Design a protein around this ligand. Sequence first.
Ligand SMILES: [Ca+2]
Ligand SMILES: [Ca+2]
Ligand SMILES: [Ca+2]
Ligand SMILES: [Ca+2]
Lengths: 145, 19
Amino acid sequence: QLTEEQIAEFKEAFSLFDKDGDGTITTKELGTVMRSLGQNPTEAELQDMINEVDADGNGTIDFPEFLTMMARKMKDTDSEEEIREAFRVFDKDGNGYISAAELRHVMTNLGEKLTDEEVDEMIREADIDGDGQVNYEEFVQMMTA
Amino acid sequence: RKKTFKEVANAVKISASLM
Ligand SMILES: [Ca+2]
Ligand SMILES: [Ca+2]
Ligand SMILES: [Ca+2]
Ligand SMILES: [Ca+2]
């Protein structure tokens, strides 16, 4: 009952954490991403996070456990706030415009290495006023359409 | 197959909910 786009988005999210593509999320990877998002969790908290969904008790999070974790952690915060957070993640210098270089640097930092051509294309997918950049209004439009 | 901004942005939206 999920759309292939949604599944694709969750798989993409999973891969951002699973930077070594070994198939699982470790406390290390969970910590890496969170840190890349302005957070600073302790090892104890990271361990707690995994154990809360580690059904097979192997010390790591697999895809089905990841989705389990996400399903409950995004029910204690609504969309608009999350969308706003993502924008802040992309707009590094916070000048209100997501540039092509910022999009590229950000995704690389999260593990998704993209070419200048690809990133330029992504920007074009959300750009509405054709200035080659994505402002909050355009970003929100993409995330809600 | 090839990534779109929407897909990638939502991945980040999802990932950022852990904050
Ligand atoms: Ca891994
Ligand atoms: Ca597990
Ligand atoms: Ca910017
Ligand atoms: Ca624009």
